[PDB]
């Protein structure tokens, strides 16, 4: 189209248009305040509108990378706030856009948000619009790769929370669960996009194509390899656009593809029609989290075409990727009960087998027992799952998190305490999310969550790396990632660097803090505990813990509280090191 900025503006409409641009500024300039971004955003909103009314106008044919970038440039505090990011502005497109993206901070250390029901309802009634885009600021800046069309849907679900709720009699009781459920779903969607972008970047497009193949085949097991491949081809393009910070394109192509899929409903899945009349964003979200359709009844056994045919090697040498793309679709549309990562890992084994049989005298011999060999690859990861859930059953989440602290602290004690804690506290939650569903959802569940939390870890680590073992697992095949991390053992090499003089001691804030912060506080002790003596007994650990709990209990029940903590504090530091040797 002859003016892009305005091509897009009619394409999306003033609201989602302004959404998207604010998301783009807030992911560029994570540290600039929200009124700053509110301005940069109406200037390009005005200018856009101009290119709607006089398309030949001065500057309308420009690209968005020059248009956006042109405004990052009139943010005078780029040195102060982002260092050499202001050097970015000096450069020409496409380098200035190359450079701005570098400065994306995956771990921005801004204040966690404590939702206060009366302040938020007051903010909401006072300014609906500013409230909405405030939610877009907050999430987007803490989550610089958040899926932009998806963000806009959640801002919409968010404000509609403050719509149902601020009204009601007990405001808090109405708000607080709903915004907490929504907060979990948001974080989840944030990790999954973050997984996509780090796949595109550390591992090549194709690698991501496999994921969308097996996952999309599981959802629409009644559609073509052709058809599937077609969507996966537009999906990949959307997803690429976002991660590159081309949000407008992104949402627009996600719009088209959703049209497209809703157009081909029966060819794909009975389920689509539910989704197919909701407006663009509720439509796009519904389709993406859409239910697994059921496999058609009379499909032939995988064994014919991949294990008994005698043209299996020939096929496999003429068109490897195709044959293995087709195996992946074929295997996938058939086992909705398997973790996407597991399938790929099955795909890979199948491959390495053919790579070995197809060179024998009798390949058909060597390879006709493949699917059996593959049925057993699933049962060991199942082993871990179930063991990890029992552990969670007998201990409950907080207990289970503390076991994961212990384990993983030992694996990688050079990793930072915040990271071991966040990572360990989320591995705890998977216990809650998954352990209870019927197994036909369980394994996908657990492995879904695993992949997102490991990829979280990997993204923090590559920012400031401190474990070779860690960098390895992060940096080989995604498909081997949980394996590698599950196989890690204590760094028999790590020194108990003392972390001494700097000591970890409590104060009376723990009395007042919401239950999770107390946990974080305690867990950070657990970690630093282990960092200082990596060999320490399970029971050793367990008694030391039983004491902090005694210690805070006594001290949160005293009338003067910090006074207690300043008094009996030292004696826990003595009590503990002798416990330790
Ligand atoms: O929220 C809205 O709908 C207004 C109109 C477009 C930009 N903001
Ligand atoms: O997209 C992929 O290929 C990786 C491997 C399994 C999990 N996801």
TrEMBL record:
Record key words, sorted: Calcium, Cleavage on pair of basic residues, Copper, Disulfide bond, Lipid-binding, Metal-binding, Methylation, Phosphoprotein, Repeat, Secreted, Signal, Zinc
Domain of life: Eukaryota
Amino acids binding Cu cation: 1
GO molecular function terms attached to this record: enterobactin binding; lipid binding; metal ion binding
Subunit text: Interacts with FCGRT; this interaction regulates ALB homeostasis. Interacts with TASOR. In plasma, occurs in a covalently-linked complex with chromophore-bound alpha-1-microglobulin; this interaction does not prevent fatty acid binding to ALB.
Cystine pairs: 51-60, 73-89, 88-99, 121-166, 165-174, 197-243, 242-250, 262-276, 275-286, 313-358, 357-366, 389-435, 434-445, 458-474, 473-484, 511-556, 555-564
Sites where the protein binds Ca(2+): 4, 11, 241, 246, 249, 252, 256
Domain annotation Albumin: ranges: 1-183, 184-376, 377-574
InterPro entries linked: ALB/AFP/VDB, Serum_albumin-like, Serum_albumin/AFP/Afamin, Serum_albumin_CS, Serum_albumin_N
CDD domains named in the record: ALBUMIN
Localization per record: Secreted
Cellular component, GO annotation: blood microparticle; cytoplasm
Binding residues annotated for Zn(2+), in chain numbering: 65, 244, 246
Protein name: Albumin
Record SUPFAM superfamilies: Serum albumin-like
Annotated residues for binding of (4Z,15Z)-bilirubin IXalpha: 237
């Amino acid at each position: 189209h002859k003016s892009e900025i305005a091509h897009r503006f009619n394409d999306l409409g003033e609201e989602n248009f302004q959404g998207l641009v604010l998301i783009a500024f807030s992911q560029y300039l994570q540290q600039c305040p929200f009124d700053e971004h509110v301005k940069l955003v109406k200037e390009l909103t005005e200018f856009a509108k101009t290119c709607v009314a006089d398309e030949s106008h001065a500057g309308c044919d420009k690209s968005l990378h020059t248009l956006f970038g042109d405004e990052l440039c009139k943010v005078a505090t780029l040195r102060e706030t982002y260092g050499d990011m202001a050097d970015c502005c000096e450069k020409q497109e496409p380098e200035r856009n190359e450079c701005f993206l570098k400065h994306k901070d995956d771990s921005p250390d801004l204040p966690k948000l404590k939702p206060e029901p009366d302040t938020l309802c007051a903010e909401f009634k006072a300014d609906e619009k500013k409230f909405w885009g405030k939610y877009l600021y907050e999430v987007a800046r803490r989550h610089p790769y958040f899926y932009a069309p998806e963000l806009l849907y959640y801002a919409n679900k968010y404000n509609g929370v403050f719509q149902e709720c601020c009204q009601a009699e007990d405001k808090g009781a109405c708000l607080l669960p709903k915004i907490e459920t929504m907060r979990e779903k948001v974080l989840a969607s944030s990790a999954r996009q973050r997984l996509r972008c780090a796949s595109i970047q550390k591992f090549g497009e194709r690698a991501l194509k496999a994921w969308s193949v097996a996952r999309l085949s599981q959802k629409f097991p009644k559609a073509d390899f052709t058809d599937v491949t077609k969507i996966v081809t537009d999906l990949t393009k959307v997803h690429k656009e976002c991660c590159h910070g081309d949000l407008l394109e992104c949402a627009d192509d996600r719009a088209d593809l959703a049209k497209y899929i809703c157009d081909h409903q029966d060819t794909l899945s009975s389920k689509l029609k539910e989704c197919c009349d909701k407006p663009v964003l509720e439509k796009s979200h519904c389709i993406a989290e859409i239910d697994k359709d059921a496999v058609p009844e009379n499909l032939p056994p995988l064994t014919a075409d991949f294990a008994e045919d005698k043209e299996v090697c020939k096929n496999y040498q003429e068109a490897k990727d195709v044959f293995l793309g087709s195996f992946l679709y074929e295997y996938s549309r058939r086992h909705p009960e398997y973790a996407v990562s597991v399938l790929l890992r099955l795909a890979k084994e199948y491959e390495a087998t053919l790579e070995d049989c197809c060179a024998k005298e009798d390949p058909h011999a060597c390879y006709a027992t493949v699917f059996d060999k593959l049925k057993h690859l699933v049962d060991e990861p199942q082993n871990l799952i179930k063991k990890n859930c029992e552990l969670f059953e007998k201990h409950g989440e907080y207990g289970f998190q503390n076991a994961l602290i212990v384990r993983y602290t030992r694996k990688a004690p050079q990793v930072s305490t915040p990271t071991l804690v966040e990572i360990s506290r989320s591995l705890g939650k998977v216990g809650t999310k998954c352990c209870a569903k019927p197994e036909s959802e369980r394994m996908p569940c657990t492995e879904d969550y695993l992949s997102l939390i490991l990829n979280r870890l990997c993204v923090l680590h590559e920012k400031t790396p401190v474990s070779e073992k860690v960098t390895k697992c992060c940096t080989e095949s995604l498909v081997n990632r949980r394996p590698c991390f599950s196989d890690l053992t204590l760094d028999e090499t790590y020194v108990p660097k003392p972390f001494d003089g700097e000591s970890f001691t409590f104060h009376a804030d723990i009395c007042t803090l919401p239950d999770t912060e107390k946990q974080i506080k305690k867990q950070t002790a657990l970690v630093e505990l282990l960092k200082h003596k990596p060999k320490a007994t399970d029971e050793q650990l367990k008694t030391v813990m039983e004491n902090f709990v005694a210690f805070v209990d006594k001290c949160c029940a005293a009338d003067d509280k910090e006074g207690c903590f300043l008094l009996e504090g030292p004696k826990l530091v003595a009590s503990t090191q002798a416990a330790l040797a």
